[PDB]
Design a protein around this motif. Structure first.
Motif, PDB file in Angstrom:
ATOM      1  N   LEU B 195     -77.889 -24.848 -78.142  1.00  0.00           N
ATOM      2  CA  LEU B 195     -77.956 -25.556 -76.871  1.00  0.00           C
ATOM      3  C   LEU B 195     -78.213 -27.038 -77.092  1.00  0.00           C
ATOM      4  N   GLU B 196     -79.100 -27.369 -78.028  1.00  0.00           N
ATOM      5  CA  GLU B 196     -79.426 -28.764 -78.292  1.00  0.00           C
ATOM      6  C   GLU B 196     -78.326 -29.499 -79.042  1.00  0.00           C
ATOM      7  N   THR B 197     -77.421 -28.785 -79.715  1.00  0.00           N
ATOM      8  CA  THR B 197     -76.281 -29.452 -80.341  1.00  0.00           C
ATOM      9  C   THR B 197     -75.296 -29.958 -79.293  1.00  0.00           C
ATOM     10  N   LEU B 198     -74.829 -29.074 -78.412  1.00  0.00           N
ATOM     11  CA  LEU B 198     -73.831 -29.433 -77.413  1.00  0.00           C
ATOM     12  C   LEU B 198     -74.451 -29.874 -76.093  1.00  0.00           C
ATOM     13  N   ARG B 199     -75.669 -30.412 -76.123  1.00  0.00           N
ATOM     14  CA  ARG B 199     -76.400 -30.757 -74.909  1.00  0.00           C
ATOM     15  C   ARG B 199     -75.886 -32.017 -74.220  1.00  0.00           C
ATOM     16  N   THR B 200     -74.843 -32.654 -74.745  1.00  0.00           N
ATOM     17  CA  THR B 200     -74.327 -33.901 -74.200  1.00  0.00           C
ATOM     18  C   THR B 200     -73.471 -33.713 -72.953  1.00  0.00           C
ATOM     19  N   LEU B 202     -73.955 -30.483 -70.396  1.00  0.00           N
ATOM     20  CA  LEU B 202     -74.700 -29.741 -69.381  1.00  0.00           C
ATOM     21  C   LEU B 202     -75.800 -28.915 -70.034  1.00  0.00           C
ATOM     22  N   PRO B 203     -77.056 -29.105 -69.636  1.00  0.00           N
ATOM     23  CA  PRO B 203     -78.165 -28.469 -70.363  1.00  0.00           C
ATOM     24  C   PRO B 203     -78.531 -27.078 -69.864  1.00  0.00           C
ATOM     25  N   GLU B 204     -77.657 -26.435 -69.094  1.00  0.00           N
ATOM     26  CA  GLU B 204     -77.935 -25.084 -68.622  1.00  0.00           C
ATOM     27  C   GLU B 204     -77.804 -24.099 -69.777  1.00  0.00           C
ATOM     28  N   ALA B 205     -78.858 -23.316 -70.014  1.00  0.00           N
ATOM     29  CA  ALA B 205     -78.858 -22.394 -71.143  1.00  0.00           C
ATOM     30  C   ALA B 205     -77.932 -21.207 -70.926  1.00  0.00           C
ATOM     31  N   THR B 206     -77.678 -20.830 -69.668  1.00  0.00           N
ATOM     32  CA  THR B 206     -76.820 -19.685 -69.382  1.00  0.00           C
ATOM     33  C   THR B 206     -75.370 -19.950 -69.743  1.00  0.00           C
ATOM     34  N   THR B 207     -74.975 -21.216 -69.853  1.00  0.00           N
ATOM     35  CA  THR B 207     -73.666 -21.593 -70.357  1.00  0.00           C
ATOM     36  C   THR B 207     -73.629 -21.679 -71.873  1.00  0.00           C
ATOM     37  N   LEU B 208     -74.578 -21.054 -72.559  1.00  0.00           N
ATOM     38  CA  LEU B 208     -74.537 -20.954 -74.013  1.00  0.00           C
ATOM     39  C   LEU B 208     -74.257 -19.545 -74.497  1.00  0.00           C
ATOM     40  N   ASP B 209     -74.881 -18.538 -73.874  1.00  0.00           N
ATOM     41  CA  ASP B 209     -74.502 -17.151 -74.117  1.00  0.00           C
ATOM     42  C   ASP B 209     -73.057 -16.910 -73.716  1.00  0.00           C
ATOM     43  N   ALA B 210     -72.612 -17.563 -72.644  1.00  0.00           N
ATOM     44  CA  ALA B 210     -71.218 -17.564 -72.238  1.00  0.00           C
ATOM     45  C   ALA B 210     -70.405 -18.620 -72.970  1.00  0.00           C
ATOM     46  N   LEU B 211     -70.860 -19.058 -74.145  1.00  0.00           N
ATOM     47  CA  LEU B 211     -70.055 -19.862 -75.050  1.00  0.00           C
ATOM     48  C   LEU B 211     -70.063 -19.316 -76.467  1.00  0.00           C
ATOM     49  N   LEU B 212     -70.793 -18.236 -76.718  1.00  0.00           N
ATOM     50  CA  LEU B 212     -70.778 -17.558 -77.999  1.00  0.00           C
ATOM     51  C   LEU B 212     -70.214 -16.148 -77.925  1.00  0.00           C
ATOM     52  N   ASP B 213     -70.172 -15.543 -76.741  1.00  0.00           N
ATOM     53  CA  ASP B 213     -69.461 -14.285 -76.522  1.00  0.00           C
ATOM     54  C   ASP B 213     -68.088 -14.558 -75.903  1.00  0.00           C
TER      55      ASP B 213
END
Lengths: 424, 305, 333, 124, 333
Positions: B195-200, B202-213
């Motif tokens: 999340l902190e890598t691509l935080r530039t 949108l910092p919503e964490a729910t768009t990270l599980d939906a970026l690895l699955d």
DNA sequence: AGCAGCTGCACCT
DNA sequence: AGGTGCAGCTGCT
């Protein structure tokens, strides 16, 4: 006073839309009664039905349709711990579901047009300057309408549960327990569904696929979600559950959380001349992605070489474990291992990835592969691994092929210690 | 939350008709909260009388099949349902949907009690395995032994007794009979740093599980981004959205002697690893912790990497 | 006092999915390496044979509609063309402690129910219910359509204490009918074992195998699944039959329904024979429901009058309440 | 002979021209009005004229029944329906013109059949 | 009184899939280890031969379409070049109890339906229907296109009680025609056995072998399968044939259709051959329906007048209703 | 002399 | 393979 034609147009559209069921023998008071009741007193009829509905972001009906309890409208506080995703992440993106009996749902349309066209969506109950020149009523009627349209966001229920709801137990640190009653995240599901259907089909997601078919792809993004599952709520009539549920068409989609191998297929390690002697490598159908990544992963420059080298090392480390699990479950799963085709040549793979003694165990059968030195298999596996990692004067003349050979050497160095603790 | 004194194997648990859905957002393997609740129930029904404590669980999935179907060559899947009895009037009932699965797993448990000193190890292992074969784990019953094969009797490995070389050889011994499948661990720090890598943007964490699955492909200005393993979105505990009530306040409660709370799921990240590629076997074990001042009720695996 | 608002019971006597294999008679005592029967596909084509509408018959339109047939693809399972019998194997465990609920709200209702079940077990054992539950293991009701038309059905039941066989039972399932319940000298030992396991001490494990001589190459009938269909141009259904690992199988709930066929005390008649133990006892293959709430012979009003108001029913109708407490369920106010 | 059967027999058949012998043409001309005439005509205009005359209170029911009986003997081609319900067995089949037969579509009865007829259209 | 809303029957004649093998005549007594007939594929190249609509039947369009050929791949099954006979083997079982339904809502309807069927069986046995059923096993009608132009057909029929042979029958299938129903002395024993099975007084399992002498390397005709994708020009598979474990076969429903070709009582003709028993008795090859509902001779009219109004529909037409009940189906609403 | 129940009907996306 | 709310009815009181 310019907000008096919208509600009149909605009432007139509802009155003229009640004409598809035309009866000339049972309409002596049905047509006149439908025209007279839907003329002026329709606002009182909506105010009478507004009490049933409730604005809710956590519904209880999805768990069971028979269950009647208490639904909650709340946004939880953010957790302190890192790496947790939830419904707290929604800020301005949140939408509200509406719960209640289905016959009241059309009245919510009259409560839902205030955010369209005009700006009096919060101006129906309070701030009645737009609710008097557009309401066109008395003071008591305006007070009754403000009391009726403000009851959408109320609490509206005593705190209760049901016997068909969940109510699990959770253990305290050195104490008793807590009862947890989980509800259904309607708004989070609606947000994830809106984020998912656009990636599946839409404007830019289909245009980038047209650019993929035209073989001229620019820098842009389109995603791909494999093996989702579908869960259905309600049935033939999904409006009983929640207003949001109908929008998805009484449905919701679920993401694959499956284990590494969920579709086992028998392993063909029988006495075959092309499937025994040539089967000392283990060309499975799950190494295509790793092989394709190792093929196109040996071209990067020294401006970003660290991540590419770490990715190549990770791919090799994963590729070793897949072959280990395939040897442990393929030959070890089937309870038979006969003589290989061409036993003078098909005996290295039949000795290394072969089972223990069986009914055909002769005198020099249980005293050959367990008593001999089980260390040629590491060099034999390295000889197969040398074909996958391509070497030449472009890499051997440079200083990266030496590290690319040393990484495979450090990986295959444990292949005799972890792959040689069974027999010896 | 200490280092356990011993490890207890449960070698090959075959479960029929477990719960497959497990979350309002996922559908695969069942949640690990089921496994921690199972070991707490097993503790309540055995360890009070055998003077031991059980807190850790390690989920190694040997095999897994699901009651699913594939319609019309579509890129989705549906669930095979069951037929319910008729209504009181006698017409039909409305259908509620649930998914069922057949899995075969193994469970390694951690023992901290003082009962190890006074009793033999094989008696404790046999009594725990005998009591465990009479209740269910995920909503589905635990299948017993079948004929024409040799069954697996479970053993009690001692972790806090011995030399370090004998320790490492015993941990290499017990990993021999649990290699067919894999283990499941949690990855909160990896999701946080991704999340902190691509935080530039949108910092919503729910768009990270939906970026690895998913399978993301940003092609050339044909390449596939390097997956570092098998990342899966899992449920990671609960989070409260209502104040704590009194034991008589809410009606239709399960028990009238325990306070009640309304609750939402929390979603995190997990990974499936081979059992060889861990340092020790006690890194795998799942624990659960609660902060009742907040509403945070969360299970995870600490002391891993 | 009143009924608890949250009440639930757990299923005792849970079976597993039964598996089907094939072979020849007079080798059935070495039937451990018999190969499994498999599900295949074939295609059917039929014509119009349904009861068409009362005014759209039209003798020129039926001729034009007969020229376009129907066309399907179905799943099917057969015995091999050299195999004679069918073997169906499953396991059962009796779980014990059949009076205590899994969830109860009040503490007075819980102890009143506890002493009611205690007076029932103290007055008479579980012997009648176990004698009726062991009949559906002695005969072979759990093979539903595989029992019709067979010339020899036999059942082998073995009790498992350690990893070895403690006691064995062999029956002739065609002599023991499907209408009456009679006590043999060999059925009583199995009934006593089921009654001892059902009284609370632990669990009791049995393994049940049934051999049916059905023919040679004839078709067999596993369970079929309930799906919501595909809806496109392709083949939508396969009339899907159930499988475990490429082997045809019967579901767990279907065998559990076959073991529960107990109550002959429902007030319609004993002409349909026994039915399955359900609250408002209804039959899926009959369309209607006996034990209506207009009379006082359903599950809810009998338990309400037996626990709260303390009027015990007849000793016949006392077995029905204990039967669907052993069955399980979720009941709330 | 009622009317519902009249619109049913008008819509389920194809549109054909020159489908009548001249004896049936004068037979139909003897049974229609004075002013209007049909010659070199197709099916649908004839059905529209007799429907308009029966909607008027001018042509009797036996006469329109003779007209629709003659149209029933004359027309021999039917339209192939898109969906077909097997009623006792609760199945719905869909016509496929490449196989010249009905293939299996879904499970359902009369309500589901009316739903897909209203969604997709009745005839091919 | 009206008909029940749930009413289903099951089939009473169960055949299996008939597998085929090949060999030489005058060795058909040692035909236990004959090798099977396998399915191969080959390439075909056709031309246009259908009717043209005379809208695009131009003189240049036809010559343009001739130059673009249609290439397809087909499945084919032949005899070996050193073998001249085909052998087809299956088993059959006759169940009996052909009046009692499988499912029924009303109990006032099923009692008088069983009364009607019981007065039929008491008035006259199953002798006529079993005679006409044994005729269709005597003349080998289940070989559909494998029977035209054959030199000699011979049929063996066994009766199986345990793993033994109780009785044997041999017939010349070409002397017994496909038109008449003439009683022999050896065919009446088979008719008595099939009636004994259909009545309910015994278990009847038969196995039927048919030998047909055709020629060396000639083509045989198994059952043909459904191909889901539309036929595609230029190399697409065009037809597929039914198989079991690497052996050609005929479907069980196709050799079951050739057993109920019974009724000659339909009002059109009786000298034009017997057709198969069906509601609105229809041949799909002819594209028409005998026994139209405009007359009073379909199944649903005769059954609803025989039970609801008690109007016997003549002895000749009463075998049609009982044969339809032996066939099976879902009748009612 | 009304309480409680119950059935059945309609509304709705 | 809809849930919820209300008009009407009964019926022995």
């Amino acid at each position: 006073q310019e907000l008096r034609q919208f509600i009149e147009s909605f009432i007139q559209e509802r009155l003229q839309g009640k004409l598809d069921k035309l009866h000339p023998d049972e309409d002596d008071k049905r047509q006149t009664l439908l025209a007279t009741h839907r003329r002026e007193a329709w606002l009182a009829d909506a105010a009478r039905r507004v009490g049933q509905l409730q604005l809710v972001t956590h519904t209880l009906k999805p768990i069971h349709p028979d269950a009647r309890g208490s639904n909650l409208h709340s946004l939880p506080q953010a957790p302190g711990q890192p790496g947790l995703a939830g419904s707290h992440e929604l800020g301005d993106r949140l939408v509200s579901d509406v719960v209640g009996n289905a016959a009241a749902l059309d009245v919510f349309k009259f409560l839902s047009l205030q955010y369209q066209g005009k700006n009096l969506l919060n101006w129906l109950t309070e701030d009645s300057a737009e609710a008097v020149q557009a309401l066109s009523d008395n003071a008591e009627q305006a007070r009754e309408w403000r009391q009726a349209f403000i009851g959408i966001t109320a609490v509206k229920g005593a705190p209760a549960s049901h016997s068909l709801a969940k109510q699990l137990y959770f253990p305290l640190p050195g104490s008793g327990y807590h009862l947890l009653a989980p509800l259904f995240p309607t708004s989070l599901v609606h947000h994830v569904h809106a984020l998912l259907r656009e990636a599946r089909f839409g404007d830019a997601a289909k245009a980038a696929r047209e650019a993929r078919s035209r073989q001229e792809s620019w820098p842009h993004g389109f995603s791909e979600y494999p093996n989702l599952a579908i869960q259905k709520f309600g049935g033939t009539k999904p409006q009983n559950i929640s207003q949001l549920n109908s929008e998805r068409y009484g449905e919701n989609w679920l993401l694959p959380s499956l284990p590494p191998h969920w579709q086992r297929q028998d392993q063909r390690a029988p006495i075959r001349h092309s499937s025994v002697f040539e089967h000392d490598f283990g060309r499975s159908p799950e190494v295509s992605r790793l092989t394709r990544t190792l093929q196109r992963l040996l071209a990067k420059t020294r401006h970003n070489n660290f991540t590419i080298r770490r990715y190549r090392a990770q791919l090799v480390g994963q590729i070793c474990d897949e072959a280990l699990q395939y040897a442990a479950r393929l030959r070890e799963l089937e309870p038979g291992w006969s003589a290989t085709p061409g036993c003078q040549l098909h005996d290295a793979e039949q000795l290394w990835l072969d089972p223990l003694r069986a009914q055909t165990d002769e005198t020099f059968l249980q005293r050959r592969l367990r008593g001999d030195w089980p260390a040629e298999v590491g060099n034999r596996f390295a000889n197969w691994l040398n074909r996958a990692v391509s070497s030449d004067s472009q890499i051997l003349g440079s200083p990266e092929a030496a590290q690319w050979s040393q990484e495979l050497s450090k990986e295959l160095t444990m292949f005799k210690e972890i792959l040689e603790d069974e027999r010896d | 939350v200490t280092d356990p004194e011993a490890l207890l194997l449960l070698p090959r648990l075959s479960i029929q008709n477990a719960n497959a859905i497990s979350s309002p957002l996922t559908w695969g393997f069942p949640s690990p909260g089921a496994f921690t609740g199972f070991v707490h129930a097993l503790q309540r029904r055995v360890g009070i009388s055998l003077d031991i404590e059980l807190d850790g669980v390690g989920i190694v999935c040997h095999r897994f099949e699901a009651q699913i179907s594939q319609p019309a060559g579509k890129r989705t899947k549906v669930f095979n349902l069951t037929r319910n009895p008729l209504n009181r009037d006698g017409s039909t009932a409305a259908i509620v949907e649930e998914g069922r699965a057949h899995l075969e797993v193994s469970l390694l448990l951690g023992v901290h009690g003082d009962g190890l000193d006074d009793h033999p190890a094989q008696e404790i292992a046999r009594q725990v395995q005998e009591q465990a074969g009479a209740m269910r784990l995920a909503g589905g019953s635990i299948l017993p032994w079948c004929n024409e094969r040799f069954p697996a009797p479970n053993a009690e490995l001692l972790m806090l007794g011995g030399s370090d070389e004998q320790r490492r050889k015993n941990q290499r011994r017990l990993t021999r009979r649990l290699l067919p499948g894999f283990a499941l661990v949690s990855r909160e720090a990896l999701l946080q740093q991704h999340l902190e890598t691509l935080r530039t943007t949108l910092p919503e964490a729910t768009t990270l599980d939906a970026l690895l699955d998913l399978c993301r492909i940003n092609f050339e200005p044909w390449q596939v981004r390097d997956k570092p393993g098998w990342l899966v979105p899992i449920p990671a505990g609960y989070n409260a959205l209502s104040p704590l009530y009194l034991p008589g306040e809410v009606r239709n409660a399960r028990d009238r002697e325990t306070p009640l709370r309304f609750v939402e799921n929390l979603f995190g990240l997990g990974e499936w690893l081979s059992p060889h590629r861990v340092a020790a076997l006690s890194d795998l074990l799942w624990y659960h912790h609660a902060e009742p001042d907040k509403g945070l009720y969360r299970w995870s695996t600490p002391r891993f990497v | 006092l009143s009924t608890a608002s949250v009440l639930a019971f757990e299923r005792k006597l849970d079976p597993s999915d039964a598996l089907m294999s094939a072979g020849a008679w007079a080798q059935r005592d070495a039937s451990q390496e018999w190969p499994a029967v498999t599900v295949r596909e074939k295609s059917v084509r039929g014509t119009i044979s349904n009861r068409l509408k009362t005014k759209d018959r039209d003798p020129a339109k039926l001729d034009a509609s007969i020229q376009s047939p129907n066309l399907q693809t179905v799943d099917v399972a057969n015995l091999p063309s050299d195999a004679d019998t069918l073997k169906v194997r499953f396991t059962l465990r009796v779980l014990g402690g059949a009076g205590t609920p899994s969830a109860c709200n009040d503490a007075a209702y819980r102890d009143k129910l506890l002493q009611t079940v205690a007076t029932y077990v103290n007055e008479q054992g579980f012997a009648e219910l176990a004698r009726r539950y062991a009949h559906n293991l002695a005969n072979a009701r759990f093979l539903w359509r595989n029992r019709v038309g067979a010339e020899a059905v036999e059942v082998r039941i073995n009790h498992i204490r350690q990893g070895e066989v403690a006691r064995t039972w062999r029956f002739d399932a065609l002599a023991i009918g499907l209408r009456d319940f009679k006590a043999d000298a060999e059925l009583d030992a199995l009934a006593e074992l089921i009654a001892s396991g059902l009284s609370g001490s632990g669990h009791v494990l049995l393994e049940v195998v049934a051999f049916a001589r059905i023919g040679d190459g004839q078709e067999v009938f596993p369970s079929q699944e309930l799906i919501l269909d595909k809806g496109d141009k392709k083949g939508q259904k396969s009339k899907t039959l159930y499988s475990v690992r490429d082997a045809a199988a019967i579901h767990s709930q279907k065998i559990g329904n076959a073991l529960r066929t107990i109550d002959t005390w429902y007030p319609d008649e004993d002409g349909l024979g026994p039915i399955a133990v359900e609250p408002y006892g209804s039959v899926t293959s009959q369309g209607k429901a006996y034990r209506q709430p207009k009379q006082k012979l359903d599950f809810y009003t009998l338990l309400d009058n037996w626990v709260l108001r303390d009027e015990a029913p007849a000793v016949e109708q006392q077995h029905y309440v204990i039967a669907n407490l052993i069955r399980g369920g979720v009941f709330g106010e | 002979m009622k009317k519902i059967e009249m619109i049913e027999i008008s819509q389920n058949r194809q549109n054909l021209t020159a489908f009548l012998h001249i004896s049936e043409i004068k037979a139909i001309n003897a049974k229609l009005a004075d002013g209007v005439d049909v010659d070199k005509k197709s099916f649908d205009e004839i059905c529209s004229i007799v429907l308009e005359q029966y909607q008027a209170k001018q042509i009797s029911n036996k006469q329109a029944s003779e007209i629709f009986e003659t149209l029933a003997k004359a027309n021999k081609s039917f339209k192939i329906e898109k969906f077909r319900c097997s009623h006792g067995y609760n199945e719905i089949y869909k016509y496929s013109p490449d196989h010249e037969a009905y293939l299996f579509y879904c499970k359902g009865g009369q309500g589901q059949l009316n739903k897909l007829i209203a969604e997709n259209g009745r005839f091919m």
